[PDB]
Amino acid sequence: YDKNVPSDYDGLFQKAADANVSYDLLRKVAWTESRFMQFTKATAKALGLRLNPELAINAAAKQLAGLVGKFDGDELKAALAYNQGEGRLGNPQLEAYSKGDFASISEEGRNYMRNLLDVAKSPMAGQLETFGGITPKGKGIPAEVGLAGIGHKQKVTQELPESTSFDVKGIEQEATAKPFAKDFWETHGETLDEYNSR
């Protein structure tokens, strides 16, 4: 459903944002939330400090820098702390992630990690990539590679109807021809009264 071949403003910006983590991850963290950083929570915008690609990708790059730096070797832990903060909800999960107890992390953290480990690198990668296989030697299928092609096309196009103006041009009118008194004036140099006195 995604590839690294198509390039746009996203790949144009994260080339420097990763220099100010990883360009492959930062291109992928944004894609999953906002297709081509989508800090939707109002508190996340007041804490992270909007809809401007000059700082949005720069905000994610700063958080994902510390999140991938708080352990320096657990990049899947970083992606998890991103959409699952470390307050009152992520603490019970993040302490249950390192022990390999993925059955007790979340219904959303697993689905998030399972979508981004294909470009991210963690020591627990190959241990979650096989977390829920149908047989213990199997690989559990994440949400958007088992639900791949299932989708209906929107039967409403941004193409709009067109009306046109009743613009008909006929023939222009002659301007207000000079008054007969002024006509006689600037043609015979003397008014009408001065011409009849002779």
Add this chain to the structure above:
Amino acid sequence: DIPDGAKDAMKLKYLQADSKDGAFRTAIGTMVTDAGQEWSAAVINGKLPERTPAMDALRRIRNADPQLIAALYPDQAELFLTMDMMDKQGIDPQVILDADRLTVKRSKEQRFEDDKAFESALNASKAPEIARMPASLRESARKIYDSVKYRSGNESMAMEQMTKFLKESTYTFTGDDVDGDTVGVIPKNMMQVNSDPKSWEQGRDILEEARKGIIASNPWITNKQLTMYSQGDSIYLMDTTGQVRVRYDKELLSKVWSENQKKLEE
């Protein structure tokens, strides 16, 4: 890939061949309403805005087909015929904008009183250019009288000024014995044959040779006597039954005068 002037000849076929609410007579109705609102705003404030697109557009579509715009919206037609009759006399549009504001500030009773007062103070003048004016010239003259009587409080200067204006610019025709010795009134502007206005005199002769020339060919008339009338750019020497309509315009008078000048050297 059709001429740019042959497109009107079809959009207007649709506009004419439309119901009263169809989306053709409803997209042009916006031009009519914008022009009407503009004319009302001009009457009230006083000044005609330098930018009047709706009224100019309606005027072009009127010149393209007059029997259509006169039929669909029969008040813009009258406005534009008045503006035509003015602009063939130099009168700036301001005159109408000065006249109407004095007529719209009037109860329906006073309009009749003022109209009787005008028609009586006009059938009391001595020059026939004024005592006997056709309806068209009486409208174009009521406008001047009203503009003057609206600017300067003079009810009396207005009369002398419109009288002088009509005397310097018009000319009564006359024939054999006719009660009131006046048969039509044509402006001295629509009778020229050259670019200098004095040439009107020359353009007069042809008419007095044409009218007689018609009487010498159409004697069966009630009296050996026609009328005379100049609407728009034309001069109608009609009959009393309307059967001898004979139309001249500045082009035809100029051609006849040129050909006549080709009869003097020989």
Add this chain to the structure above:
Amino acid sequence: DIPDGAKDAMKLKYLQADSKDGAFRTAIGTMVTDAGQEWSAAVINGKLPERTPAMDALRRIRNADPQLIAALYPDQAELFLTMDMMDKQGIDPQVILDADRLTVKRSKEQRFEDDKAFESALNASKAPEIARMPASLRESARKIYDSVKYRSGNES
């Protein structure tokens, strides 16, 4: 396979036997409106266009059944009776087109004044062809008086 003149005798039976909005009196109503708009445009501009299809068509359908067109649209009936009374005297239509333009540029008060003035300047003539004219001839004569008084300023 019916005579071409017996078809009118049935389309008109339908048109007469119709409600006021039915699609019979609504497809002919377009002829009436086009003719009315044409007559108004003629009064305003001055000239009667050489191409007047709506008014001619209404005139033919009037001659086919007069007590129907006079009943449905009772103003085209009057227009056409006036045009008939004129055309039996040579008077070109222009006369009406010269008369009405002087009557439509008139407030409702002046019409009464002018009509009294005419009827008094007519009961003052000495030949009885003029002092005592029927109503029909007085209309066809008011039209001539108005055409002349509208072309040449002479009220006299």
